[PDB]
Amino acid sequence: MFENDILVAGGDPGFGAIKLDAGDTKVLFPAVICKGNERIFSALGNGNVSRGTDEEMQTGSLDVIVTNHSTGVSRHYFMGSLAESLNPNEAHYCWDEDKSTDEEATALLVVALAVAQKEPKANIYLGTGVPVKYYAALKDKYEAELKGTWSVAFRSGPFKGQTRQLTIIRSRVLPQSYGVFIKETLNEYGIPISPKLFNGYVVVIDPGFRTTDVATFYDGVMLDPPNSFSIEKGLKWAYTGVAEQLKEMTINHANPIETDDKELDKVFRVNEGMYPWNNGAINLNPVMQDMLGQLGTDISREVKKSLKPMLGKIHTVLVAGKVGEMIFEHLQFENKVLIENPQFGNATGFRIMAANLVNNITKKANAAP
Ligand SMILES: Nc1ncnc2c1ncn2[C@@H]1O[C@H](COP(=O)(O)OP(=O)(O)O)[C@@H](O)[C@H]1O
Ligand SMILES: [Mg+2]
């Protein structure tokens, strides 16, 4: 790695989960935020058991004050998986692409970088990616916003105390699916590794949480918007279906289940589709894989609507994101690859791009900074 521990790090392909690649270490948690309170009653030992294997795997157990050090203002958050399990009435996914407003939407990534950073203060060069259709109209705003000094104070577990500071030197922003293509085509040190991916046509898919995003790479180049686009049918649309089916499985009761997506996401993350109830369990997995039969069909049709003129030419369809593991058997393409370590595909490519933009000839000193 580099001769100074400034983070070269790539991350926030986040609407379902912030995820972040910093080389030998990685951060991952669901993108749930709450403007948390003192935890005063619920701090009791009554269920306060830790199950983690590292400080890294203390991820998502996050209880913080975040400070915009560049402006001297501060806010208190429960962040990630903890917030599913403190304020389930008021904790929510942050849900807009724009981060010019919404310091909340930046705070998730600020916390993730502070978890990644091993030592109390350092500088960072950042890679990240907005969803594909926005890259024509949004990247410059992130390249202004997502910069300068931040700090995080922590109260839970191995993180506790330790009021870390970090400074983003500068950020490189890319269209979200491109990170997958990058991590598949390039070595750690930016050398290309298989011309089989460069020549002819490749299609690359993040079947993501808020959105499913698709880009066509021809001869090594991402093609322009009518060939590389974005689709509102992300996993959250399937949970909106599962919620109506769970409601119609409990409308027969005197007061029906009325879950927002967050509880279904919890139920698939934590305990494999068994929604908790009297007599122990309601099992959603039949309903869920009935929905992902729909969503995988629809991602295939929403693709073919814009790509069918090209369809015969395609070497392969790359699939990424957590939902890649959930949908991949159902997508209607003859040559099709689920990329290695599916979760991080966008983030890893953003790190590899950040390494390019933190050479001395791109942005570093000749000295250690
Ligand atoms: N730590 C985790 N444990 C289990 N499932 C996870 C975890 N992190 C993310 N997922 C789940 O994967 C889905 C999000 O997929 P993701 O690739 O992160 O979508 P996106 O890139 O578009 O934001 C959600 O259901 C989310 O809860
Ligand atoms: Mg995604």
Numbering used by the authors: 1 to 369
Paper text:
ParMs generally exist on low-copy number plasmids where they contribute to plasmid segregation and stable inheritance. Here we report the discovery and characterization of two chromosome-encoded ParMs (cParMs) from the genomes of Desulfitobacterium hafniense (Dh-cParM1) and Clostridium botulinum (Cb-cParM).
Dh-cParM1 forms single and tightly coupled double filaments and is highly conserved on the chromosomes of five of six Desulfitobacterium species. From a total of 2845 images and a final selection of 71,060 particles, a 4.0 Å resolution density map of a Dh-cParM1 single filament constructed from two parallel strands was reconstructed displaying a helical rise and twist of 24.5 Å and 156.03°, respectively. The single filament structure is constructed from two parallel, staggered protofilaments. As observed for other ParM protomers, the analogous subdomain 2 region to the DNase I binding loop in actin was clearly observed in the density as well as the characteristic ParM closed beta-barrel in subdomain 1. Due to the limited resolution, we cannot unambiguously determine the state of the nucleotide bound in this structure. However, ADP appears to fit better into the cryoEM density map than ATP, which is consistent with polymerization initiating hydrolysis of ATP. The interacting residues surrounding the nucleotide bear similarity to those of ParM-R1. The hydrophobic residues of subdomain 2 interact with the hydrophobic pocket of subdomains 1 and 3 of the upper subunits in a ball and socket manner, similar to that observed in pCBH ParM. The helical twists for Cb-cParM and Dh-cParM1 protofilaments were different, ∼167° compared to ∼156°, respectively, with Cb-cParM being more similar to ParM-R1 (∼165°).
